[PDB]
Amino acid sequence: PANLLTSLVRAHLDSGPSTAKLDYSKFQELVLPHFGKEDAGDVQQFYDLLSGSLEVIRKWAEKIPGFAELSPADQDLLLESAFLELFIWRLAYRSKPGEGKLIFCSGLVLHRLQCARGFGDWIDSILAFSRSLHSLLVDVPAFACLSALVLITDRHGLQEPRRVEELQNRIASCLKEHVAAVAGEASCLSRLLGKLPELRTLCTQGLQRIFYLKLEDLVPPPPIIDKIFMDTLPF
Numbered sequence: 001p002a003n004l005l006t007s008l009v010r011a012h013l014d015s016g017p018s019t020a021k022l023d024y025s026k027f028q029e030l031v032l033p034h035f036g037k038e039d040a041g042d043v044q045q046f047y048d049l050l051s052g053s054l055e056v057i058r059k060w061a062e063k064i065p066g067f068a069e070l071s072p073a074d075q076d077l078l079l080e081s082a083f084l085e086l087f088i089w090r091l092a093y094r095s096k097p098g099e100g101k102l103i104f105c106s107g108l109v110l111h112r113l114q115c116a117r118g119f120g121d122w123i124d125s126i127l128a129f130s131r132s133l134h135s136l137l138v139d140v141p142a143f144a145c146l147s148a149l150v151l152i153t154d155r156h157g158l159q160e161p162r163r164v165e166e167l168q169n170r171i172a173s174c175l176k177e178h179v180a181a182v183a184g185e186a187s188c189l190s191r192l193l194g195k196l197p198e199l200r201t202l203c204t205q206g207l208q209r210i211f212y213l214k215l216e217d218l219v220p221p222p223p224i225i226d227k228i229f230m231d232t233l234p235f
Contacts, residue, residue, distance in 0.1 A: 004065060004174045005141055011063035012144035015056055016094060017107035024109050027101075031113035038117045042164070043219040044106035046209075049104060051222055053087045056105050063149050066090065066167045071159050078164070080228050082151040084203040089149030089150055092130035093143060120212070122205045129202050133195060139182065142192055150196060156234070 034114050061079055070078070094103045100112035102123075113181050116123045138146070152168045154161060210229050214221060221229065 001174070001218055003113045004170065005145070005178055006088070007063065007065050008144040008148055008171070009141050010176070011142065012147060014063075015060040016090065016105050017103075021107045022103065022109055023107045024078070026114075027109045028111050028114055031111055034113075034117070036117075037119075038216075038218065040115035040218045042115075043216075044118075045115060045212055047219065048227060049115065049118075050084075050225055051088060052108075052225055053090075053105050057083065057086050057090075061151055064152070064171075066170065067152065068082050069122075070163060070167070072156050074164065076162055077155060077157055078151050078153070080231050082153070082175070083228050084206045085150050085199050086125060087149065088203055088206070089147060092126060092133050093128050093138070095127070097127045097130040097134060100125055120209050122209050125202055125205055129198065132198075136191060136194060136195070141178050142175060145171055145178065146192060147193065149175070149193075150199065 045099060058079060061075075065077065090105065091102065094105070095101060096103065102110050102112065102115060104110070112123060112127065115123055119126070138233075143227075148171045149168060152164060152171060154164065175192070176189055179192065207229065210225070213219075214226075214229070220226070
């Protein structure tokens with residue numbers, strides 16, 4: 001319901017670090033001028049940061065009611081298709097863009113300039129989207145619904161597209177009820193939903209970055225990221 005909202009909230013909160021579990025031991029407030037542009041260590045870091053979210057997102061998804069009742073092929077295709085978008089959406093919400101501070105799902109905290117060489121300019125686009133999301137003051141329950149809506153969505157190749165749309169609709173209406181219960185019986189809802197296409201567009205820049213890095217080939221992508229990259233190219 002109801003129970004659906006609670007389940008979604010609980011899945012969200014169990015998929016990320018507690019405040020008390022944040023790790024600042026690598027964090028730098030003042031980042032020294034760096035002599036270089038990307039090297040192998042910056043590329044490896046970028047791929048390690050993406051990889052650190054694969055298992056987390058998969059376990060979160062399996063707690064969404066109904067997700068495990070989709071065909072196994074539909075589940076995998078939804079997860080592959082949404083992976084960058086989910087990695088970015090959850091990062092944007094967890095991070096503190098007013099301090100240039102990125103907070104990863106392990107609890108690792110890095111300043112912008114500490115991972116900018118790996119991410120490239122995409123990191124600035126990500127912090128701009130994070131500042132925009134933060135201004136909206138999205139509460140945890142609405143966020144927990146939106147995340148699920150990022151994943152459970154139409155994609156090309158689904159075996160049971162209507163069943164994906166039915167589940168999406170359940171989640172969308174759970175969100176809409178919640179937003180009325182906090183604002184009762186337009187603007188706010190359409191503003192939450194409007195972040196989803198923005199997110200997808202932002203993630204085109206992630207695919208661009210991975211293409212560039214594979215072209216440069218200092219460090220190849222790990223196999224699961226590479227598969228997600230190749231499977232989500234529509235050509």
